Copies of this chain bind each other. A is one copy, B any other.
């Protein structure tokens, strides 16, 4: 209970009163635990190198029987575990009594060990201490290795120490990001940094904050799209950024207020080049992590059967306007925001009984029509939704053959959007929103070269590559209410 904390807290006072520093300043580690393994993992059983004295650190995760001559411990560090065999014969009695300097070590304590490598006669690789010091004691009681359950979200430090699956989840998350950064850097791109506080944000509700020195409300950025396109006008033909974006929307299993995004912009490249980029990226991404393009994902949870997602390119391409016109057997007349087609789309929303968006705009009705009849159609492999109407794509260049549409693409995994790209609209006259930042509109008048931009959802991508059902499991500290 709280009793264990009260006992360990006053033990720290005892050692302080006995002239011992329970939190010493420096302990010179001469080898880490993973490095300890590789250097001595092929030693014989019972073979001791008693004449190679190491200095090792780590956390105690298991204390064994208190045999008054042999002590067994578990030293875990950097995600890997070794054994500690404290023998009275090998212990240095010059610094303290053997039984006295080991009965005080509880499970969870950070210790510093001076010893030599070797293997047990059983066959377990162990470090044999001649000297053991407490570096940082654990006042509370650590849970068992299967005791975590939303504590993993608030006390993430416990979740990283107890559940082995949690570390792997984040060792691969930053590997997905590092692979993405190298993928663009090796193709001649340019990582930059665009501001997060502006005067207008540019489908999102804005986080409003106030600057006290300037006395003006600033919108937290919802997308790094506009300032990156302004950098394309500036000459930076291949630019990207990987940072946090903000949505003041709802919180559920696949949405978070802040979330990691990546947007690159490619000069003189178009919609066809963006499809090839995503096919090359995701295929090599999952092959870099797994040695294969087919991955297993549990859409229904770990208790149920998983599905197989094949990442072998190419991926299916599906036009949104056509399949909405097929699965519903309807014909939508352009313009889609006419008072007749708007009513016709609402009629389909009420027949098939779907949550009608609020308010009923032709863009939201088309998006809602695609979210039910198209998105959750193909789950065993990623696919693109292509050629969105310009009523749904204000900054996407008009389609070069079919009127009313654009050259847009959205890739989905298990029916969730993880990618958004299109050929960038560069005509300032065809951009009617410019009669949006007025600084962006002015930058279009200075000449935006034919550009293709693409946006990636880092958190959702990491979810499906780690077999996770909730976005709270790919973020170290998800924002919640105390």
Pick from B57, B212, B429: contact of A13, CB under 8 Å? B429
Q: Report chain B residues within 8 Å CB of A230.
A: 156-157
B154 & A439 in contact (Cβ 8 Å cutoff): yes
Compute how far the CA of A139 lies from the CA of B249 in the bound complex, rounded to whole angstroms.
Answer: 39
Q: Is A423 an interface residue (CB 8 A)?
A: yes
- A356 an interface residue at 8 Å Cβ cutoff? no
A258 with B197: CB separation less than 8 A: yes
> Who on chain B is nearest to A24 by CB?
B450
Residues of B within 8 A of A78 (CB): 235-237
Residue of B nearest to A79 (CB): B235
The CA-CA distance from A109 to B235 in the complex, in Å, is: 12
A268 cross-chain contacts in B, Cβ below 8 A:
26-29, 57, 112, 135
Contact between B76 and A23, CB atoms less than 8 A apart: no
* Size of the chain A interface, CB-CB below 8 angstroms: 115
CB of A482 closer than 8 Å to a CB of B: yes
- Determine which residue in A12, A185, A479 has the highest number of CB atoms from chain B within 10 A of its CB, and name it: A479
Collect the chain B residues with CB atoms within 8 Å of residue A160's CB.
231, 234-236
Question: Which residue in chain B gives the minimum CB-CB distance to A438?
Answer: B482
Binds B, one of A44-52, A300-308, A381-389, A440-448: A440-448
By the criterion CB–CB under 8 Å, are B212 and A244 in contact?
no
CB distance from A431 to the nearest CB of B (A): 11
Contacts of A196 in B (CB 8 A): 244, 258
The number of times this chain is found in the oligomer is: 2
Query: Which of B25, B140, B155 is A400 in contact with, Cβ under 8 Å?
Result: B25
Counting CB contacts under 8 A, is A207 at the interface?
yes
- Name the B residues within 8 Å of A360 (CB-CB): none
Q: Pick the residue among B25, B27, B76 that contacts A423 (CB under 8 A).
A: B25
A251 to B211, CA, bound (A): 10
A59 in contact (CB, < 8 A): yes
Q: Is the CB of B250 within 8 A of A447?
A: no
Whether A157 contacts B25 in the complex (CB less than 8 A), given A205-B212, A448-B136, A476-B193, comes out as no
Which chain B residue lies CB-closest to A80?
B235
Asked whether B272 lies within 8 Å of A195 as measured between CB atoms, the reply is: no
Q: A27-B268, A59-B235, A235-B167 are in contact. Are A142 and B211 (CB under 8 A)?
A: no
CB interface residues, A 367-418, toward B, < 8 Å: 397, 400, 407
Smallest CB gap from A212: residue in B: B248
Query: Which residues of chain A from 140 to 195 have any CB-CB distance to chain B below 8 Å in the complex?
Result: 140, 142, 154-161, 167, 170-171, 174, 177-178, 185, 190-195
* Residue in B closest to A22 when the chains form the complex, CB atoms: B427
- Residues of B contacting A22 in the complex (Cβ-Cβ under 8 angstroms): 427
A327, CB-defined interface residue at 8 Å: no
C-alpha spacing A156/B233, complex, angstroms: 9
Chain A positions 467 through 481: 1 when the CB is less than 8 Å from some CB of chain B, otherwise 0: 000000001111101
* Interface check A313, CB cutoff 8 A: no
CB-based contact B195/A26 at 8 Å:
no
Give the contacting residue for A442; candidates B12, B155, B244, B446; CB below 8 A: B155
Question: Shortest beta-carbon distance, A229 to chain B, in Å?
Answer: 9
For the complex formed, measure the closest distance between the CB of A187 and the CB atoms of chain B, giving whole angstroms.
12
How near does chain B come to A32, taking the closest CB pair, in angstroms? 8
Give the complex CA separation of A359 and B196 in angstroms. 30
Q: Which of B26, B210, B400, B449 contacts A208 (CB 8 A)?
A: B210
Taking CB atoms, residues of chain B closer than 8 Å to A479 are: 195, 197-198, 211, 214, 218
Quick check: is A5 within 8 A (CB to CB) of the other chain? yes
Cβ-defined contact, B212 with A209, below 8 A: no
Contacts of A154 in B (CB 8 A): 439
Residue A283 CB within 8 A of the other chain: no
In the complex the two chains form, what is the Cα distance from A447 to B136 in whole Å? 5
Residues in chain A within 8 A of chain B (CB atoms): 5, 9, 12-13, 22-29, 32, 57, 59, 76-79, 108-110, 112, 135-140, 142, 154-161, 167, 170-171, 174, 177-178, 185, 190-199, 205, 207-214, 216, 218, 220, 227, 230-231, 233-237, 243-244, 246, 248-251, 257-258, 260, 267-270, 272, 397, 400, 407, 423, 426-430, 439, 442-443, 445-450, 475-479, 481-482
Closest 3 CB pairs of A and B: A157-B234, A160-B234, A138-B447
Extra A-B contacts (11), CB below 8 Å, given A174-B191, A195-B475:
A12-B427, A22-B427, A25-B397, A59-B235, A77-B237, A78-B237, A160-B236, A161-B235, A197-B257, A209-B209, A216-B481
6 chain-A/chain-B pairs, Cβ below 8 angstroms = A29-B268, A76-B235, A136-B448, A174-B191, A195-B479, A214-B479
